[PDB]
Paper text:
[name] ([name]) is a pattern recognition receptor that initiates antiviral immune responses upon binding double-stranded RNA (dsRNA). The extracellular domain is responsible for ligand recognition and contains multiple leucine-rich repeats (LRRs) that form a horseshoe-like structure. Here, we use computational protein design to create novel miniproteins that bind to human [name] with nanomolar affinities. Cryo-EM structures of two minibinders in complex with [name] reveal that they bind the target as designed, although one partially unfolds due to steric competition with a nearby N-linked glycan.
Following a strategy previously established for structural characterization of TLR4/MD-2 complexes, we co-expressed the [name] ectodomain and each minibinder in HEK293F cells and co-purified the complexes using affinity chromatography followed by SEC. This improved occupancy, and after optimizing grid preparation and data collection to overcome a clear preferred orientation, we determined cryo-EM structures of minibinders 7.7 and 8.6 in complex with [name], each at 2.9 Å resolution. Minibinders 7.7 and 8.6 interacted with the concave surface of [name] in slightly different manners, with α1 and α2 of minibinder 7.7 binding to LRR15-LRRCT and α2 and α3 of [name] binding to LRR13-LRRCT. Hydrophobic residues on both minibinders (7.7: M3, Y6, L35, V36, and I39; 8.6: Y30, Y33, A34, V43, L47, and V51) form hydrophobic networks with I510, I534, I566, and I590 in Site A of [name] as intended. Conversely, [name] maintained a stable 3-helical bundle through core hydrophobic interactions. In contrast to minibinder 7.7, the electrostatic interactions mediated by Y33 and conserved residues (R29, Y30, K/R36, E42, E46) in minibinder 8 and its derivatives surround a hydrophobic core interaction network in the [name]/[name] complex. Interestingly, our structural analysis revealed that the interaction of T38 with A35 and I44 stabilizes the loop connecting α2 and α3, facilitating the formation of hydrogen bonds between S40 and E42 of [name] and E639 and N667 of [name], respectively. Additionally, the R50D substitution in [name] enabled the formation of an ionic interaction with K589 of [name]. These observations likely explain why the G38T and R50D substitutions significantly enhanced the binding affinity of [name] compared to 8.4. When the cryo-EM structures were superimposed on the AlphaFold2-predicted models of each complex, the Cα RMSDs between minibinders 7.7 and 8.6 and their predictions were 1.0 and 2.0 Å, respectively. For [name], the α2 and α3 helices were well-aligned (Cα RMSD: 1.6 Å), but α1 was slightly displaced from its predicted position (Cα RMSD: 2.7 Å).
Residue numbers in the entry:
A (entry chain B): 1 to 56
B (entry chain A): 27 to 335, 343 to 696
The structure:
Amino acid sequence: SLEEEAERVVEELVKEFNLSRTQEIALRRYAEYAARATASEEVIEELLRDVAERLS
Amino acid sequence: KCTVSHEVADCSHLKLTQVPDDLPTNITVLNLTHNQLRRLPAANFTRYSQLTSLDVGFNTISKLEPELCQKLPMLKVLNLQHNELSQLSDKTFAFCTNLTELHLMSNSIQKIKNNPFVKQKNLITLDLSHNGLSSTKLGTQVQLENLQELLLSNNKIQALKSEELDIFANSSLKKLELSSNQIKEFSPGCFHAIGRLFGLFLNNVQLGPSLTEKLCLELANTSIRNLSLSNSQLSTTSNTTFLGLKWTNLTMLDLSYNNLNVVGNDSFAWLPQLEYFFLEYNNIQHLFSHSLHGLFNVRYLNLKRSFTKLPKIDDFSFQWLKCLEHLNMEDNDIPGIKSNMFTGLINLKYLSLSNSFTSLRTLTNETFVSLAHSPLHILNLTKNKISKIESDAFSWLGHLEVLDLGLNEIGQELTGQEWRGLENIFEIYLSYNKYLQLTRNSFALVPSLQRLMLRRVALKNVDSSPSPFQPLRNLTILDLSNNNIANINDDMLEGLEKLEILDLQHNNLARLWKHANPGGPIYFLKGLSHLHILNLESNGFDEIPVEVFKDLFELKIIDLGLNNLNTLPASVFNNQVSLKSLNLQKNLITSVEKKVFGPAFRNLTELDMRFNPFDCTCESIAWFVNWINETHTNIPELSSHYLCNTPPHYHGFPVRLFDTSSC
Ligand SMILES: *[C@@H]1O[C@H](CO)[C@@H](O[C@@H]2O[C@H](CO)[C@@H](O)[C@H](O)[C@H]2NC(C)=O)[C@H](O)[C@H]1NC(C)=O
Ligand SMILES: *[C@@H]1O[C@H](CO)[C@@H](O[C@@H]2O[C@H](CO)[C@@H](O)[C@H](O)[C@H]2NC(C)=O)[C@H](O)[C@H]1NC(C)=O
Ligand SMILES: *[C@@H]1O[C@H](CO)[C@@H](O[C@@H]2O[C@H](CO)[C@@H](O)[C@H](O)[C@H]2NC(C)=O)[C@H](O)[C@H]1NC(C)=O
Ligand SMILES: *[C@@H]1O[C@H](CO)[C@@H](O[C@@H]2O[C@H](CO)[C@@H](O)[C@H](O)[C@H]2NC(C)=O)[C@H](O)[C@H]1NC(C)=O
Ligand SMILES: *[C@@H]1O[C@H](CO)[C@@H](O[C@@H]2O[C@H](CO)[C@@H](O)[C@H](O)[C@H]2NC(C)=O)[C@H](O)[C@H]1NC(C)=O
Ligand SMILES: *[C@@H]1O[C@H](CO)[C@@H](O)[C@H](O)[C@H]1NC(C)=O
Ligand SMILES: *[C@@H]1O[C@H](CO)[C@@H](O)[C@H](O)[C@H]1NC(C)=O
Ligand SMILES: *[C@@H]1O[C@H](CO)[C@@H](O)[C@H](O)[C@H]1NC(C)=O
Ligand SMILES: *[C@@H]1O[C@H](CO)[C@@H](O)[C@H](O)[C@H]1NC(C)=O
Ligand SMILES: *[C@@H]1O[C@H](CO)[C@@H](O)[C@H](O)[C@H]1NC(C)=O
């Protein structure tokens, strides 16, 4: 339930990296798989930051 | 008293009868949002001579003396919501003009009396939502010189007159709201009296025929740009309705939720400048070719569930939507695609056809024909009950980037002829399918793929062929779960180097990581370098090969739980370095030490060694309990998770409470 708040994270990225709508789908899929794999936190932020850096 | 973060006295729910009177003298947001006050005199407030944002919402103030504003010249925004400001006076706030926003909602002010406010030199926005007001006479002379966005949200207004708005002679309005009030008259001349009436909301009022016909006349020669008639009953439309809106240059409209049954021939032809267009949630039953005449400037279209459950989109019924960019045909019973449905849509970029069709059981070559000349970047296509994709069903789609074919009933033996074309495919969402048997050439026509989702798809021919996944070379995600794959060859995952996710969850590979299998344990996680996540869980590997994990160097998640796994070998995590997670929930591990789990616990940030019952001996958990001493690793809570279970001598003890000094 609380992990859903992490969407705002990528939403910040959506504002931080003004990229295409198609790349938003890629970011969402990567985040969903990581969250279903990772335990709690502090790796989602790092992994999603690295993905956003390697997507633009 | 109250929580104070920086300068806000967030006395949100702290039932009070008096003012705080003991908080720092430099607070800004005295957020008394429920604290049951009754009086705000000019004695206790002299302590707060610096208050700016006073919110006293949801409280019973029945009187406002003018002197209160005398001691508060620094106030900017005040929210007198759900108070009892019933009896108003001329000088209830006379020299109280340094505001920037004001609210008087749920105050029940039947009459505005003569002139409560005349100066308001900086009143940008004002609200009077649920009072009971039955007019719009707020003042007498030129006034509201800076009121940008008025809000008469829910009143009992029954008409509009020019003289009632003469006080708006030179008032610049951005968005004016008069929703949720039953009006059955618009006296001649209402909105060209207002200097710059720009926006206008008439949501949820029954205008309909014989009223909108004169409303479009009245708004003529008025500088209105936006308009919203959502839930305003519009059963039909003709070429006379919205005639007068041709001179006044509108830009956005809203006809949602008004049960629009049939569209007349030349309706909406008097709207050359309509950019957005909202017809969602309607009961539309027929769409003639001429119905959308004149809509050459509509960019965004919304038809989510307008086509109620059969509709017949006529031939060339979209040829005039030249400037359309985003179509939203989502919840409809559209009966198939004819050869000339989406003809003329040379500016489309997003289709979103999911839950739209009820007859797309098969996709033949002459099924997507109408989109030959249309750009199309997204093609949703979920929950369309597709039974089988025939040959060359996507030959007409060359700009397509997402093929989200999930939630379907695709049962077929793939061969490779269904992907002919598709030179720009970036995603093939094939999750939740019946059965998809493969061949060695099942993906040779799509070497541009990037995300092959194959969850809940019984996937045969994974071992007999050389590799179904050999042609794919730019694959980032290979999701394989809920498939019960029980056999893998040493070249299943070969040549795939920039693969980053290898989800494998509901898979019965437990047999092929044994030691007695013919030929030795299967070394299939071989060669990969950028495998960031390897979610091998819920399989049953009660063994791990000595050097199976050699290639995985940039691995960060090795989630491995729900596995009868026990007694790890040595040097299993010898070479993994950036291991920022290591999950072993529900295993059979009884011993942990420097070779079993040592090199993993160096830069770790999450550990899930939760439910495995280690033997409770001073040698079984010694380095473990001297490692949980200092934990820069953000370990989950250590209470009621780690328990002694095996030896009756010291059974039933958390690891942190084990007396280490004894050993
Ligand atoms: C508003 O008042 C608060 C309450 O004292 C001030 O917060 C303190 O400020 C001092 C010095 O500025 C710090 O040393 C304290 O750590 C702060 N917190 C306390 C005392 O809890 C705040 O600085 C004041 N702000 C202004 C603009 O006067
Ligand atoms: C809005 O203003 C236009 C003027 O630009 C009005 O058009 C005039 O209409 C009258 C009769 O209604 C004609 O006699 C004039 O010749 C028109 N002016 C022209 C063509 O320049 C229009 O009627 C106004 N809308 C109203 C009153 O609803
Ligand atoms: C709007 O549509 C109506 C049809 O309901 C049109 O009325 C027709 O106009 C033509 C041309 O003047 C004439 O044959 C008759 O007056 C009508 N014919 C029929 C069969 O109804 C009307 O012209 C259209 N335009 C306007 C501005 O009302
Ligand atoms: C779509 O597929 C059908 C089915 O193969 C094609 O119809 C055949 O077309 C060829 C070439 O004109 C004829 O020789 C056959 O007799 C047709 N029928 C069958 C059953 O094969 C159709 O031509 C295809 N459309 C396009 C545009 O290629
Ligand atoms: C294609 O359309 C479907 C249906 O709207 C999308 O599935 C939705 O995905 C969002 C993602 O947060 C969920 O919240 C919704 O619940 C899903 N819909 C349903 C009915 O469950 C799907 O995401 C779309 N495809 C793409 C690529 O965006
Ligand atoms: C004041 O309290 C209300 C009540 O919930 C809240 O909505 C608002 O955000 C608060 N203002 C602040 C914290 O500045
Ligand atoms: C009005 O309020 C603003 C900010 O609250 C302040 O800067 C200004 O000096 C005030 N002016 C008067 C006349 O009170
Ligand atoms: C019309 O409404 C939209 C949606 O809120 C808004 O973005 C736009 O600015 C409005 N038009 C004007 C002229 O303000
Ligand atoms: C026509 O549209 C332009 C576009 O800004 C606007 O300035 C003008 O006022 C409109 N004409 C009217 C409302 O009569
Ligand atoms: C005009 O629209 C009406 C809508 O009822 C339709 O019956 C008629 O055929 C249309 N005229 C055409 C298509 O020429």
